[PDB]
Amino acid sequence: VGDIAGLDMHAAMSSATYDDGTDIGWSGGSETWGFSSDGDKGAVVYDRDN
Amino acid sequence: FAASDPEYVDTLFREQLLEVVMEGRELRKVAREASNVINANTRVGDVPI
Amino acid sequence: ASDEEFARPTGQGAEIRDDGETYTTVAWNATKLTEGSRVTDEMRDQAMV
Amino acid sequence: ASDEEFARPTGQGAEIRDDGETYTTVAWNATKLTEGSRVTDEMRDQAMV
Amino acid sequence: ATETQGEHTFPVEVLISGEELRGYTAGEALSAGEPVYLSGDYEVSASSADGGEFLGVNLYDVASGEPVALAGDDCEVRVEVSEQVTANDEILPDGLGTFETVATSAASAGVAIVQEGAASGEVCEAYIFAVQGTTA
Amino acid sequence: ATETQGEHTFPVEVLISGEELRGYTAGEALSAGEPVYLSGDYEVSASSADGGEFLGVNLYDVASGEPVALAGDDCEVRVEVSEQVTANDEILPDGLGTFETVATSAASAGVAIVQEGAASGEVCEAYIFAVQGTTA
Amino acid sequence: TDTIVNVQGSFFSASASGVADTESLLIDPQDAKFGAIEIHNIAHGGSVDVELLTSSDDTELVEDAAVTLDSFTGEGISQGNQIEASDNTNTYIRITNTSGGAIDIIATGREVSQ
Amino acid sequence: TDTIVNVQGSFFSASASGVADTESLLIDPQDAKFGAIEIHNIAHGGSVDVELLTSSDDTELVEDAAVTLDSFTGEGISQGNQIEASDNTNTYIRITNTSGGAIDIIATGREVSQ
Amino acid sequence: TDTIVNVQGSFFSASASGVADTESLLIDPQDAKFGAIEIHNIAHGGSVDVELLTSSDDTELVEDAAVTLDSFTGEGISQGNQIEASDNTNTYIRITNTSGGAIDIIATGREVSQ
Amino acid sequence: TDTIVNVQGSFFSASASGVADTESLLIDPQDAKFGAIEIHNIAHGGSVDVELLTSSDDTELVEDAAVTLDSFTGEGISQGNQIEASDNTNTYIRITNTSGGAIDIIATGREVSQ
Ligand SMILES: [K+]
Ligand SMILES: [Mg+2]
Ligand SMILES: [Mg+2]
Ligand SMILES: [Mg+2]
Ligand SMILES: [Mg+2]
Ligand SMILES: [Mg+2]
Ligand SMILES: [Mg+2]
Ligand SMILES: [Mg+2]
Ligand SMILES: [Mg+2]
Ligand SMILES: [Mg+2]
Ligand SMILES: [Mg+2]
Ligand SMILES: [Mg+2]
Ligand SMILES: [Mg+2]
Ligand SMILES: [Mg+2]
């Protein structure tokens, strides 16, 4: 799981942690963090150094 | 109000510019491994077939 | 203990507000589970086991 | 930095041409995140933790 | 006032910010977040409705005759409401251990301003800014 | 508010004294010394005229949605007035980013008291003593 | 040579009891696990208009395109349809009651791969 | 290249012999091992009403929405239907005898995934 | 013995809102992930001409062959079609508005292997 | 329990533009990678005869048997057919123009196993 598709780190994150804008003073991001319905962003694959 | 950043952002200090410039797109470089390489003695030459 | 929270986005010079660790309990109240069995002396004598 | 581009084919004794490194910036604008809590001295003494 | 995290109910921390924390004596048994007024000399009891009876809110549970810590004006507080409050609503004591809006009450000026709105029976966040005593 | 010293313009220090400095989110673009009220949950917007809309003065310039600091009550403040103010005048927001006297407004009570008098468009020194919200 | 049994892929249904004289059942492919639906059956306890909609929003119906497919009269069943809707293509099906009173609507079919 | 043989469905049927003059056969998807059913054939020994119901209980019929799909006169077969019902949607199909005497009813179809 | 569940297809749709009085929806198989499409449903908010085209270019539309399949009159739906197109065969479907104003067009189907 | 998504078919099409007054499109199963074809759609830009031929040669059309299946008239579409041909059975389909002028022809279908 930490060594898949040429990736060498898995960063497992929480459901609550993305900014949905419901917390006070937090201005929501553009996306939906999830994996349940159309447009849900469930993973990000990336270069750690960028 | 008291002295604070949003008031004096460009009058008491400069916004940081990072010392490291971040790299653009790197293209894959393989031709030397991927072919027979001739280090030619001349700019023009012929290979016998 | 209470759940972890997210720290609060704040202005400069503004008061840091309190959201302290908050506590509760679950109360155990151990319930006496009991079981009895009675046997006569003649039963105890005559049984093979 | 701009992306890597490709060198240009040239005649012999001819002027080398310029496609030097061009640059841009990415901004950051850090937001203050704050958390606070308060405890009375008597609570601090009496608590098991 | 209480908060839910799964099956657990937690005691709400009445104080969000402020240092206007003052010692009185309880004239009766008081609960946390309860609005209170002066019933005798340095002695506080729970507020009745319709104004003229507010010094602050009680910070922890006390029996009758015990020393109370009170949050006065200049405190941001988590307080329970009997009706729907929007932000910028003025609230004052309800008479029921809670806050209601100035709009609902027979009074015409409040003691706290609502900073975070809440439904009936829920916890708003408010800023205490005034005291009400007797004017005749 | 701003201060001309020859060719130079300087920002006016909004805060004279006090520690009633509290964090909110800007509901619109706000400028230093501007009066504000709660437009949403911990969200503040520019006050309108005739009272019922005051929490404090904006300490520094902010864009919409940014975290703002306010001076609330028990702050002494430097603020811009739309009319002549003498000492002991009660003032509240004019709806123009400035303050006016209670005497000029349709309101019957103010939010600050003028300590140092000023002409129209100039900086008075005032003490913030109240907040005003929705009473119906 | 290898022999396999085929069971048909997931059943889908949306239903409403006592939908009012001008209200609607909205069939949303978000409710399907495969994200896309094919409606074979529309059962109506009175007259209904069937409408096929595209949304301008990925998650809620905010109408962009709308076509009234057909109007069914009285109580009955329509079967053998292939009315097709997807979440990723943002399509919705609305069955609107047009009887002079409340009706019951049941729609069924199957899930299709998005 | 790989070649597979497809055997269709899993068989589903409900039946009643001599259902009384005003009584009914209740087709319940809970009887199917995959939990959903698609009825194709209704054979009826006399006149019948077909009714499609949603229940308000997860396991028993407690009527919420109800629609009479069609009425079949006389004795015969209705074939090539696709009346669909499932357990976790609590859907039910009722065949009601209207003939005024005792009749035989046989419904057939196949199981479908839940 | 070995028992598998079959989901019946992969979904495809093209849609346009307010397509003008002589404009068209181009249904392009290059938008499908499997490379070929089969349109079953055309829902039309007014009158339309349906046209099938071969391109002389592998990726753009440069009309080699064209046939008007049918003309649909008024608002409605055509369902159960099998209008077929793919990238490698350079086939496109064009739905052209013929109404005296703008309309909404929704086309649906499934993907087929290239 | 194991669940599979079924994408149907492999696409097949032959087409021609401006085929002359008595010339033809020869639909040849040798062009299918699976060796056999089932044709669903014949789009014709004028009147055409459909003809089905067996060849006495494995690779070229040397007519053994020939049958004219139908004559279509005007510009239009014939859809949902199952006209069928394979290479090892040396079967060819000929669409012959009868319009008295040049027309466009598009045939589509899917590949079948040999
Ligand atoms: K005060
Ligand atoms: Mg999407
Ligand atoms: Mg040479
Ligand atoms: Mg908390
Ligand atoms: Mg030169
Ligand atoms: Mg360049
Ligand atoms: Mg303070
Ligand atoms: Mg969607
Ligand atoms: Mg059930
Ligand atoms: Mg269930
Ligand atoms: Mg192509
Ligand atoms: Mg190609
Ligand atoms: Mg052959
Ligand atoms: Mg052979």
UniProtKB/Swiss-Prot annotation, chains G, H, I, J:
Q: What is this protein called?
A: Gp30
Organism of origin:
Haloferax tailed virus 1 (HFTV1)
